[PDB]
Structure 1
């Protein structure tokens, strides 16, 4: 089997991407944030505290003839941005782009933190990291990809995120029309539960490539590119007037600037992030200070190849017995 679904930016900045997902019988379609940095499929629901729902579409398990309470199971998750959610668990039929999993754990939110409530466009998350990170207790649950894998034509999914435009998540096949050149594959460590890999270096604009190993994660659920402070300083030093602002929470730059590109290495190959992809617009409405799309990872503990980086590439998440990642230009 295969599946193919369009993923759409939630706003004009590409702050996140939503992909429609069919849950239950008859289908209830929710727009989920596909997140290769986590491993829970959770949804706003009829059980979510009413004051914490503000415009999201909810899953109502009582209206699904295939929903079954997973007795005794609870979940609770906290994300790197400080947001969180928790609740109980159903199993139900879940379909993405024509690919159907029966018995998928659908984690129903009883509580969500303010940032989720305040984002009316995201009805939940669909985790695509390794199932070892799934938070369901006392019986850990598998991700949608893990459940689908054996049925797929090939045990892979691909992320093709657009810049200020829709893109595609495919399951079970590699669309050879969706990229240019060849796909360069690179090793993955699953030891932290992530799609963790090592970039071979970077360049700023037309500058020379610096060969240096940068361990990080391919994370579709993180907006920006978070890299070591040395690398980030070298980037922003090429933008007149750019500075790190403790009050704003990162590098800002004059909105009048033209940003240089940023290149990262994948083995001997190179992915170029155009300068425009690094512009996240005014820090507040009407400001002439703009927020940068490359930020320091120093306070995180891990480097994160988020959407800013991934949207410059066609990305293969290869879930073979020994997982690997593939990157191609597009």
Structure 2
């Protein structure tokens, strides 16, 4: 119990259901460990994506509390604007009272219009929360609604069901062996240090180490462009004049397990994981994009990675636990 079931949309997005207001208005939101804010479309929104998604109506809630505090948030793939407000939020079988969240005014782009989810529930550290809004999880812990100051995440594969986020707890059943604890190098995103990225003992990228974040909100395993370029060349992934990274669907069954070394423990990612096989047309699972930070060039370990291991986010001792998916 205390779990939040998540749907798997084409192994590209994982979202669960939450209720807001009294009585509850439901919305589907990505449980994004790559950010810290909670927001959903509202009757005040004017963007396209809002014409076809659930919209929060403050007047239908006997518990809502308005504010005139507006904010604008920008992510790696998009941005949004809104107004903050307070209400009770139903998530993971818990009743999160006095939770601040955003009622969107805009959220441009076709991506959102075609997206199968309504909003975003940020699971990262408060320091990266727009206008310092109290993140849902910090609110759960502050009001004693969770047994332990941590949460676990399991992401299904091959469009399967069963995906879930366990709030305030860890569940053995979802993993084999024991959890390897990794210290958080920088508190904001769930950041850790990547020792090395090497296949066949050969350092293909991130030499001498690099910074990385664990983000459920990202689908692919991205890394700085200059480095990813090699990655493609080192696996046989080529680009066509259509954009997509075309690569042999055969390579899957004959390539080396690219291994991410974290705190002295190797985490192998077979080409049967970093290769996106939709049809008889296969594509790479790596994406080039420079994400500059004061901590350097960031690498994002998305679902392509999380899918392989049950990940525990421990806010009690600031650590990330990892172990192969059961």
Are residues 1:44 and 2:41 paired?
Answer: yes
Are residues 1:89 and 2:84 paired?
Answer: yes
TM-superposed deviation, 1:154 = 1.0
User: Which TM-score applies when normalising by structure 1?
Assistant: 0.85
User: Which TM-score applies when normalising by structure 2?
Assistant: 0.86
Contact 1:251 1:295 in 2 (8 A): no
Cα distance between partner residues in 2 of 1:233 and 1:85 = 31
Contact 1:184 1:266 in 2 (8 A): no
Where does 1:181-196 land on structure 2 (aligned, <5 Å)?
A: 181-191=177-187, 193-196=188-191
Where does 1:1-330 land on structure 2 (aligned, <5 Å)?
A: 3-10=2-9, 12=10, 14-49=11-46, 51-69=48-66, 71-81=67-77, 83-136=78-131, 140-150=132-142, 151=144, 152-164=146-158, 165-166=160-161, 167-191=163-187, 193-204=188-199, 207-208=200-201, 210=203, 212-228=208-224, 232-233=228-229, 235-240=231-236, 242-244=237-239, 248=242, 251-255=245-249, 257-258=251-252, 260=255, 261-280=257-276, 290-298=282-290, 301-320=297-316, 322-330=317-325
Contact 1:271 1:313 in 2 (8 A): no
Cα distance between partner residues in 2 of 1:255 and 1:57 = 39
Cα distance between partner residues in 2 of 1:182 and 1:296 = 33
Gaps of 5+ in 1: none
* SS, match of residue 63 in structure 2: coil
Cα distance between partner residues in 1 of 2:270 and 2:51 = 35
Cα distance between partner residues in 2 of 1:158 and 1:274 = 23
Deviations 1:4-60 (A, max 9, x none): 0111122x2x12111111211111221101111111101012221164424312222
Deviations 1:58-85 (A, max 9, x none): 222211111111x22112111112x111
Cα distance between partner residues in 2 of 1:160 and 1:209 = 30
Contact 1:74 1:88 in 2 (8 A): yes
Deviations 1:184-233 (A, max 9, x none): 11111335x211101222343xx337585231111111111012457645
Q: Given the superposition, is the C-alpha separation of residues 243 and 27 from structure 1 closer, same or farther in structure 2, using an over 3 Å criterion? A: same
* SS, match of residue 147 in structure 1: helix
TM-superposed deviation, 1:269 = 2.6
Cα distance between partner residues in 2 of 1:254 and 1:54 = 40
Gaps of 5+ in 2: none
